[PDB]
Amino acid sequence: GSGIRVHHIKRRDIVLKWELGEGKVFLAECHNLLDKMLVAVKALSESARQDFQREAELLTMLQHQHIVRFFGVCTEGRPLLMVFEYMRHGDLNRFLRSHGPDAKLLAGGEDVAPGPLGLGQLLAVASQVAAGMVYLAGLHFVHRDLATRNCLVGQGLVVKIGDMSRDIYSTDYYRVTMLPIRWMPPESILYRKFTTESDVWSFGVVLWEIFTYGKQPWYQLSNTEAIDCITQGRELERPRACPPEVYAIMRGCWQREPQQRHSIKDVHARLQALAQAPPV
Numbered sequence: 292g293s294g295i296r297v298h299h300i301k302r303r304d305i306v307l308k309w310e311l312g313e314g315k316v317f318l319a320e321c322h323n324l325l326d327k328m329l330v331a332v333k334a335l336s337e338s339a340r341q342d343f344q345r346e347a348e349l350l351t352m353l354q355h356q357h358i359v360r361f362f363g364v365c366t367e368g369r370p371l372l373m374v375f376e377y378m379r380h381g382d383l384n385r386f387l388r389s390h391g392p393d394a395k396l397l398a399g400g401e402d403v404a405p406g407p408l409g410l411g412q413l414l415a416v417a418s419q420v421a422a423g424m425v426y427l428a429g430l431h432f433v434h435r436d437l438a439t440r441n442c443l444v445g446q447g448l449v450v451k452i453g454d455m456s457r458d459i460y461s462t463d464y465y466r467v468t469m470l471p472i473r474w475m476p477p478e479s480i481l482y483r484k485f486t487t488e489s490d491v492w493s494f495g496v497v498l499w500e501i502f503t504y505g506k507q508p509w510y511q512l513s514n515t516e517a518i519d520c521i522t523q524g525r526e527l528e529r530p531r532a533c534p535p536e537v538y539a540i541m542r543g544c545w546q547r548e549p550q551q552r553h554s555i556k557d558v559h560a561r562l563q564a565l566a567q568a569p570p571v
């Protein structure tokens with residue numbers, strides 16, 4: 292039984308506090324991965340135990356400053372658990388909306404101002420997501436559902452790529468098997484091909500999400516309508532909050548031919564530079 296050693300955690304050391312969302316994520320304390328400690332815990336046939344073990348091995352290998360930190364599993368008894376660091380500001384899409392000009396409530400937090408994010412800040416969020424993507428492309432890992440709903444925000448506005456998904460985001464998938472069509476490129480919709488270049492397209496849509504403070508791409512349109520748009524070559528419009536240099540980077544992610552799309556490495560480098568010195 293060769294493979295990656297996955298860290299195991301005794302059940303007695305996991306104390307579940309409350310559900311945060313629905314796989315079915317709870318907030319918990321864990322002693323002692325250090326003192327005692329807050330963590331996020333995902334709860335779940337032998338075929339499932341197979342995917343569990345498999346995904347666990349994979350999660351163990353993919354470790355990077357912008358990938359949500361994975362601590363191990365608990366498999367003594369049922370249900371099976373995956374243990375992750377806790378990202379106190381939840382998912383990026385919800386975070387964005389709560390700092391949008393549209394938000395109905397004020398979003399306290401000692402570590403960020405309520406109200407619209409600074410441009411410097413939006414840029415930092417995008418840079419961080421890209422860095423996550425650079426790492427994954429490096430490993431030839433293809434993420435088939437890149438979107439702010441699958442990113443996590445932690446203390447100090449650290450952003451990491453996570454996982455799905457929350458039932459509140461069902462509207463973001465189209466039932467064919469559920470596809471995130473609004474984030475998919477023509478070659479995915481047309482030919483069912485998914486590549487690192489497909490992820491670069493998705494990331495472009497993530498950029499649009501960030502600079503609209505979390506709006507659904509093509510929110511005015513039905514699923515088939517959005518598919519017509521994507522395949523017929525229509526592009527999402529520049530967000531009001533989005534500077535030309537960034538819209539340019541977006542457009543580059545959206546080349547109809549995958550090979551003309553800029554590399555994720557390139558994309559990240561530009562965003563990081565914009566970020567270190569935000570244009571007016």
Ligand SMILES: N#Cc1ccc(-c2cnc3ccc(N4CCOC[C@H]4c4cccc(F)c4)nn23)cc1
Nearest residue numbers: 311312313316331375376377378381382440441454
């Ligand atoms: N695999 C996996 C995995 C990894 C980490 C986490 C995690 C760590 N800190 C938090 C805080 C809130 C939270 N949420 C917010 C909404 O309730 C569901 C859950 C979630 C589920 C699906 C996708 C999300 F980006 C976030 N998740 N989370 C959750 C799942």
